[PDB]
From a paper:
In this study, we identified four enzymes (two GH183 endo-d-arabinanases, GH172 exo-α-d-arabinofuranosidase, and GH116 exo-β-d-arabinofuranosidase) from [name]. These enzymes completely degraded the complex d-arabinan core structure of lipoarabinomannan and arabinogalactan in a concerted manner. Furthermore, through biochemical characterization using synthetic substrates and X-ray crystallography, we elucidated the mechanisms of substrate recognition and anomer-retaining hydrolysis for the α- and β-d-arabinofuranosidic bonds in both endo- and exo-mode reactions. We propose a d-arabinan-degrading pathway for Mi. arabinogalactanolyticum based on its gene cluster and four characterized enzymes.
A complex-form crystal was prepared using a catalytic residue mutant ([name]) for the co-crystallization of A9LT. Unexpectedly, a linear tetrasaccharide without the tag (A4L) bound to a putative carbohydrate-binding module (CBM) domain that adopted a β-sandwich fold was revealed. The bound A4LT molecule in the complex crystal form spans subsites −3 to +1, and the arabinofuranose ring at subsite −1 adopts a 3E conformation to hold the α-anomeric scissile bond in the pseudoaxial position. The side-chain oxygen of Asp33 is located 2.8 Å from the anomeric C1 atom, making it suitable for in-line nucleophilic attack. Asn51(Asp) forms a hydrogen bond with the glycosidic bond oxygen between subsites −1 and +1, suggesting that it is the catalytic acid/base residue. Pro141, Arg198, and Leu292 form hydrogen bonds with A4LT, while Tyr293 and Trp138 form stacking interactions above and below the cleft. Glu243 is the third Asp/Glu residue in the active site cleft and supports the side chain position of Arg198, which plays a pivotal role in holding sugars at subsites −3 and −2. The activity of the D33N, [name], E243A, and E243Q mutants toward A22BβT was nearly abolished, confirming that all three Asp/Glu residues are catalytically essential. The arabinose unit at subsite A is sandwiched between the aromatic side chains of Phe379 and Trp468, and hydrogen bonds from Asp365, Arg381, and Gln470 are formed.
Author numbering:
A (entry chain A), B (entry chain B): 2 to 480
Write the structure that this text describes.
């Protein structure tokens, strides 16, 4: 939809330009999902779906025959400072220097083409990773699974076995093919969808210590929790996709994220069986085309909600953030209009929620041309100060955080990114020189005694033919 | 010298192709030294000299006018697993996304062209960083300093102040311009050289809590520790350079590392004042041209000696390792001859400590063409198995660790790195596909009942015009 996107892009976690350098360290050049859980020992484990190495070019998933296709890979983080990204400090390797597939697949189309992680959790000293055995793929949002399964590891994710526990997909409509686990107290709630993205979500619950025992599951049947899976009823209507569910102590609500139709949405509930509050836009397909996934970071707290988002054309995973109040309502949204430049192929005059720029400037538009999406802004010249800017309404006296991703021609020597008055006087800014990789810059400032500022990025071009590119600009209130 | 290099390259820590991606994270594209210390709070702080960003090309230090020249930068590590590299987890930034200069300099040639870190330590909750004020550079190994200073930080390296404590260099021959600190008991021993690389080392000591108080220093004069800096006599003869000293609990010895003439060497002592045992070669200029630095990692233990080494042409810092026994003798040296391919410009026949390869192959030779140095081996064809190999003498029944750095053309699909019998039967190997960045591969194997193996790397080349490059191959006994 054209709904506004409250969420902010924090970092590209995987693939080209990613700070993490998954490509260099582990031959993770392109991948998706980024399903996260707390390993019970001070770390976050993060699992990915179909992963490709050095020869991948994109756009999209898929690679040449030498693409080092693994159905899945796993990395670890110990990073508690998510505002500045999420550093991966380890990966399951084999050989060393290459992230290995941890849940094997046959890679025979129409039998089992791949095995894709869905959700993860730890109980005591055991890690568990839910997955789906994919028989074959159809058009977007459509695929067939053989079963949902569970792998486990007793050494923090170093080595894995596949358990015998499965939800078989007898008739293609089994409701627990694609799962999402949340633990509260001594109980794991297991949400499930059918294969693909056109069906509803169901829920079951199991004592945390009995996750591998299907007979210990009880299924919400609309009145109570019963033994038969075939009694399960939907708790959230179709259409729903891959899902993530987190218990947020701050708001005393379960939060659920999913791609529903076009957009990633969030709903909230005081109990897993519902009632689930109406969908709130997290990210729209207009701002983040061919987005999918959406998995909560397990160290979210205090109303700060970090999550991983996938996107088809760049075929890589981004860390995202949004904020909620104590009722689970999204607050302090990105106030920048058209933050990812995806909504227009030209510039405006900088007013009324449009971007402006000096000559020579425009929107580059091609598959995965953006930092995210297919669009980015540019400005280029060979004389004087050359910038890109947008007027943004603000609350006088409030403090703001401005983040954005930019890069320059190698011969760039002086650029700035920041906020200024509508008269052009800088309020807060930083100074960059030559920027190779897409790089996030971050500026926090007081809006002061005014109802609007101009967010901007630009380069001095006195020294030569110099360009800057820009994407995914966010202005959000600081609390 | 042409002496053999016992040390093994572990990882490139900074710059292009480094796993750490200091370039993308922090605009640390090229830099030197990598002076390390324990910050007292479970981390290693690492300081660097003159640092350049995105526009740097090399070879060597210096950059274009937009090269984001900083006199120094500082990163952090929490990494206890040095066998697979040293992950940096933070850098002192400003703006965020750019590692900043932490010790200012005037950058006026003949006054103060730069400020270079020399050594660091923590005492309680304070970090200290020694540095030299550089007035002007001369030819290699020669420069003039104004003084040695000490900067300090009370917030774990986040912010820095330059103290008023200085060793001034009125006549150019002050013996403590370039310091190396080591703490044992509550005493810091302060080793010192003149400016540049042609003089001897002296030693001073100070109670750890009084590092900033020059009146608390005592200076070894050959008979006792006295109050006057002018009484200090050499404890180690010229020529010596930048230095590192570590107290090794394993050997109950102080270890000293420095570039002495052409080679990085190590000496040992049971007391800081000496006597210092004769120089042992760590890395020779023949294998590692224009090497310098050599700083011990503070978490060295059990005889495993990790250290950082700089090298001019790639102008970046590498983690290295060697092993000692309980007497402080280097043991278990790299058994591969001409490990970095620098000693010859053409291939041999694989015997007598030479490299061989199948057509089309040779030694690439250009400034900073190596992973390290100017040389790397290459093999390239479009048919069959195409490899680079060397016969290496082994001890029957012993276990060995083979590491080496390689990369491939993007269209590579299947290569192997490992050890095999002289008759070509693999003993242990790994399988790689397409390798973009220089990447280290690691193989451990039993030599079994034989006293030679062939170490190799190669690519299958049926799928196209495929090449592999290879550098810094090491085979060392496992303990
Ligand atoms: C055919 C396909 C999907 O499977 C093969 O395996 C590789 C990719 O695998 C990753 O993709 C799976 C998810 O696939 C769904 O998501 C795609 C993108 O969705 C976004 O774009 C569409 C179009 O508007 C919207 O649905 C959404 O916003 C969609 O096309 C797929 O149905 C993961 O499970 C797996 O890890 C490729 O080599 C190849 O692609
Ligand atoms: C002029 C110089 C050195 O300083 C300017 O700032 C940048 C580089 O600075 C780093 O260089 C210093 C060390 O410089 C010495 O090391 C060089 C390399 O040594 C190897 O080559 C020679 C000959 O084989 C041997 O001494 C050794 O094996 C040598 O030329 C220098 O004297 C660090 O303190 C500093 O951070 C450049 O822009 C420029 O270079
Ligand atoms: O890949 C990086 C970006 O390149 C593409 O840039 C598109 C822009 O390039 C042209 O503008 C740059 C062009 O203008 C400047 O020179 C202009 C000359 O015109 C007058 O005669 C003189 O004042 C001046 O010398 C110089 O910087 C260069 O030649 C323009 O066609 C377009 O807007 C982007 O798509 C990428 O992001
Ligand atoms: Ca975009
Ligand atoms: Ca070399
Ligand atoms: Na972080
Ligand atoms: Na490591």
């Amino acid at each position: 939809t054209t709904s506004r996107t409250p969420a902010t892009v924090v970092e590209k976690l995987t693939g080209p330009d990613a700070p993490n350098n998954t490509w260099g360290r582990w031959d993770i050049k392109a991948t998706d999902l980024g399903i996260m859980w707390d390993d019970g020992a001070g770390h976050v484990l993060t699992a990915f779906g179909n992963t490709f190495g050095n020869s991948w070019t994109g756009p999209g998933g898929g690679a040449p025959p030498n693409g080092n296709w693994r159905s899945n890979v796993l990395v670890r983080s110990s990073d508690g400072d998510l505002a500045d990204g999420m550093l991966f400090d380890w990966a399951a390797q084999g050989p060393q220097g290459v992230a290995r597939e941890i849940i094997p697949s046959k890679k025979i189309n129409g039998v089992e083409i791949t095995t894709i992680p869905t959700t993860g959790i730890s109980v005591g000293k055991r890690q568990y990773l839910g997955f789906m055995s994919v028989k074959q793929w159809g058009p977007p949002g459509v695929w067939d699974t053989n079963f949902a399964g569970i792998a486990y590891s007793d050494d923090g994710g170093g080595t894995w076995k596949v358990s015998d526990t499965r939800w078989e997909n007898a008739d293609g409509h089994d409701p627990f093919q694609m799962q999402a686990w949340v633990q509260k107290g001594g109980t794991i709630y297991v949400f499930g969808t059918q294969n693909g993205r056109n069906g509803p979500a169901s829920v079951a619950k199991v004592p945390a210590s009995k996750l591998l025992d299907k007979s210990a599951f009880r299924y919400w049947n609309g009145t109570d929790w019963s033994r038969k899976e075939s009694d399960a009823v939907p708790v959230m209507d179709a259409p729903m996709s891959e899902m993530s569910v987190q218990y947020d102590a701050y708001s005393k609500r379960f939060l659920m994220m999913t791609l529903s139709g076009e957009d990633i949405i969030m709903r909230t509930a005081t109990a897993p069986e519902g009632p689930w509050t109406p969908a709130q836009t997290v990210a729209s397909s207009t701002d983040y085309p061919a987005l999918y996934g959406g998995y909560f970071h397990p160290w979210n707290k205090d109303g700060e909600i970090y999550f991983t988002m996938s996107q088809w054309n760049p075929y890589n995973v981004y860390l995202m953030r949004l904020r909620i109040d104590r009722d689970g309502n999204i607050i302090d949204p990105n106030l920048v209009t058209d933050a990812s430049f995806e909504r227009s192929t030209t510039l405006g005059d900088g007013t009324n929620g449009t971007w402006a720029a000096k000559p020579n400037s425009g929107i580059d538009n091609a598959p995965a041309a953006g930092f995210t999406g297919d669009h980015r802004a540019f400005v280029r010249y060979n004389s004087g100060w050359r910038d890109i800017w947008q007027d943004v309404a603000v609350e006088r006296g409030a403090k703001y955080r401005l983040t954005g991703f930019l890069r320059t021609s190698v011969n760039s020597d002086n650029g700035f990114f920041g906020a200024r008055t509508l008269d052009g006087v800088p309020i807060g800014e930083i100074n960059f020189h030559s920027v190779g990789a897409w790089t996030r810059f971050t500026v926090e400032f007081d809006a002061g005694d005014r109802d609007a500022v101009q967010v901007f990025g630009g380069v001095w071009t006195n020294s030569g033919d110099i360009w800057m590119q820009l994407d995914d600009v966010s202005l959000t209130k600081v609390r």
